[PDB]
């Protein structure tokens, strides 16, 4: 195919004030559709049954690029694609002059490149501090997935077979993608994306829409669901994948690797009385960051459970009180931390969120923490 001249020069982007911490810092390549570097070859010319395999070879070469988010020579980014725009949806168009059987395979394969790019871009957006550590860890896991699973499979298996295997074919690509279940993993991630995304849009849309404790609610709904608001998505998705052991296993693993810092934060609150929430994802926030009798606020929107039932309200308050008593003790003793040997009650870290949320376990975990907080507190008050 004849070569066309395009002044293709790679450079770093000048404006970073509008780029997420993990966003791309390099200009996109010139597009085929406006600046092809090659005269195209109509595939019509090789539609013949004896040349048909060649047509397929050319099509597969594009599919490999489509899967990693690049346009090809027969499959192109659609008409409104705008590579400099983080908000532009991406669709692909398939050259009309193509064997119709390939055109249908292509649509089925192409959709994954679409998901790939979306997930890629989404995790980059989520690298901002504005989204919270729960989402950021998820964004991490997405990125990690793509590096180690998606692309690894693609290169080790598909690029490799394209280059090395006689009888390698387009029908095989479909089989392999499903064979490794990478598409299910992506489909789940994609659907999580869609769920959070639509949730964000709903939130964005809705701009107009006994204990001696200073406990106020903060009914603010955040544009970005954070903390429990995210963890709930995962829980709900698991509940929608019931019976698919592979899928739920994946989702559970994933959730436990997302909730890990959340759990740590909760643990310290409950065993140390330490509030440390730089991204404002934890319920129970207060002022100042003397004057110790400050108000505590409950971010209803980041809660793991509703606070409408009596039982969960009671649990929430117990968790709150637990940390407060510990906070008092740390202040009173002028210590950074309360050691495990400060009491006869020792409490293990939360290392499995999903398990903690299985029912009853949370209440007991908290009760143990609470009991401990009182043991320590009372010893101080009646001895110290």
């Amino acid at each position: 195919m004849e070569i066309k001249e395009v002044d293709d020069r790679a450079e770093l982007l000048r404006y970073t004030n509008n780029i997420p911490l993990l966003g791309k810092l390099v200009n996109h390549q010139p597009l085929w559709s406006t600046n092809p570097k090659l005269k195209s070859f109509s595939l019509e010319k090789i539609s013949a049954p004896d040349q048909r395999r060649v047509q397929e070879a050319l099509v597969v070469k594009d599919l490999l690029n489509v899967l990693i988010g690049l346009e090809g020579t027969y499959i192109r980014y659609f008409n409104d694609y705008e590579p400099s725009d983080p908000e532009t949806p991406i669709e692909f168009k398939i050259a009309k002059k193509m064997d119709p059987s390939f055109k249908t395979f292509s649509r089925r394969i192409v959709r994954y490149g679409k998901q790939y790019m979306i997930l890629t871009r989404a995790y980059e957006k989520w690298s901002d501090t504005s989204f919270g550590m729960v989402l950021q860890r998820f964004a991490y896991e997405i990125r990690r997935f793509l590096e180690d699973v998606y692309l690894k499979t693609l290169v080790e298996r598909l690029e490799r077979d394209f280059n090395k295997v006689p009888n390698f074919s387009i029908r095989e690509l479909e089989q392999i993608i499903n064979e490794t279940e990478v598409n299910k993993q992506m489909e789940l991630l994609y659907n999580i994306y869609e769920e959070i995304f639509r949730e964000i849009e709903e939130r964005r849309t809705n701009q107009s829409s006994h204990l001696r404790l200073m406990v106020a609610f903060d009914t603010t709904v955040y544009p970005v669901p954070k903390g429990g608001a995210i963890l709930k998505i995962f829980q709900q998705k698991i509940l929608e994948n019931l019976g698919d052991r592979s899928s739920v296993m994946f989702l559970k693993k994933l959730l436990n690797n997302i909730s890990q810092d959340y759990c740590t934060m909760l643990y310290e609150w409950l065993t140390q009385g330490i509030l440390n929430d730089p991204y404002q994802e934890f319920m129970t926030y207060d002022d100042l960051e003397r004057a110790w009798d400050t108000q505590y606020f409950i971010r209803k929107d980041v809660l793991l459970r509703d606070c409408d039932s009596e039982e969960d309200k009671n649990l929430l308050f117990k968790m709150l009180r637990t940390g407060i008593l510990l906070k008092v003790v740390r202040a009173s003793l002028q210590i950074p931390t309360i050691p495990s040997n400060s009491s006869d009650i020792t409490i293990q870290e939360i290392n499995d969120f999903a398990d903690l949320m299985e029912g009853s376990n949370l209440e007991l975990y908290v009760d143990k923490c609470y009991s401990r907080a009182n043991e320590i507190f009372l010893k101080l008050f009646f001895q110290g």
């Binding site: 195919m1 070569i3 001249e5 395009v6 293709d8 020069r9 790679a10 450079e11 770093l12 993990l22 966003g23 810092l25 390099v26 200009n27 996109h28 390549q29 010139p30 597009l31 085929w32 600046n35 092809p36 570097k37 090659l38 395999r53 060649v54 397929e56 070879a57 050319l58 597969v60 070469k61 594009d62 690029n65 990693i68 690049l70 346009e71 020579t73 690298s127 501090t129 550590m133 729960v134 989402l135 950021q136 860890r137 964004a139 991490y140 590096e147 692309l151 690894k152 693609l154 290169v155 077979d161 394209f162 280059n163 295997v165 006689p166 009888n167 810092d261 440390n276 730089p278 991204y279």
Partner: protein, 261 residues
């Protein structure tokens, strides 16, 4: 059939440069050096028409590392010539270490001979790209910016959900806080304010107008409460201030030299 699809697609790409040749010059691009295939201009990499846009899209994704590398290398070289706070040197040094690790990694991939394609290469260096991007953004403002501000920002990032980010922020933080600690020691053990470049909350103030030019009524030490870092209790910062002031008083005016030493 008897051939792979690559063999069949081949005859249409005969006018273009194969991946073998591209890989032979990629290692140079990745270290931001120039080459015969990819002349590396001051800030741009020239891609020949002989490499289709099909592959160019990947090369941009790959080449970004070389460009980021270059940018960080310049940040290092610029600052290497300046009289700056040790706190910045700590950041700079960490950048140089990252660049050294980057380099070794890249050289190892190339020398291993196991990279046979660009898709493979890209995937293999994917993480390094991410790491450089993180640093590149952290160094974006490494100019007109104090050491404490950086420590604060890093503390935010130390809590970031992304594992790579928190590791990087942590390492940068630790490299810098170590020298912050040294400032505290100089003050606490010597009453010394040295090489702070305005990046330490306790300051010398000898800008007098006859109001004790000889420092017999006051010791020309003051501190900015607003510059006390987040990790030091304000009350303690006060004690720190007073210890060094007391040190000075005793050593300089009371001449309690044997004791003080």
């Amino acid at each position: 059939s008897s051939v792979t699809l690559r063999q069949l697609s081949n005859p249409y790409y005969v006018n273009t440069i194969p991946e073998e040749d591209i890989l032979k010059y990629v290692s140079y691009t990745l270290l931001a050096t120039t080459s015969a295939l990819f002349p590396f201009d001051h800030e741009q990499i020239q891609i020949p028409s002989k490499i289709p846009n099909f592959e160019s899209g990947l090369l941009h994704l790959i080449f970004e590392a070389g460009l980021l590398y270059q940018s960080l290398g310049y940040k290092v070289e610029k600052f290497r010539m300046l009289n700056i706070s040790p706190m910045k040197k700590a950041l700079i040094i960490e950048i140089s270490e990252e660049l050294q690790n980057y380099t070794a990694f890249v050289n190892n991939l190339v020398s291993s001979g196991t990279v046979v394609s660009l898709k493979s290469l890209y995937r293999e260096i994917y993480e390094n790209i991410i790491r450089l991007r993180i640093y590149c953004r952290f160094t974006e403002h490494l100019e007109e910016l104090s050491g404490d501000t950086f420590l604060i920002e890093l503390n935010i990032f130390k809590s970031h959900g992304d594992l790579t980010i928190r590791k990087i922020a942590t390492n940068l933080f630790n490299s810098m806080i170590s020298l912050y600690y040294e400032y505290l020691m100089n003050w606490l053990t010597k009453g010394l304010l040295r090489a702070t470049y305005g990046e330490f909350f306790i300051a010398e103030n000898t800008d007098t107008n006859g109001t004790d030019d000889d420092f017999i009524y006051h010791i020309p030490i003051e501190f900015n409460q607003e510059r006390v870092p987040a990790f030091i209790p304000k009350e303690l910062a006060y004690k720190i201030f007073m210890i060094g002031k007391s040190y000075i008083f005793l050593e300089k005016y009371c001449k309690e030299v044997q004791w003080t030493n």
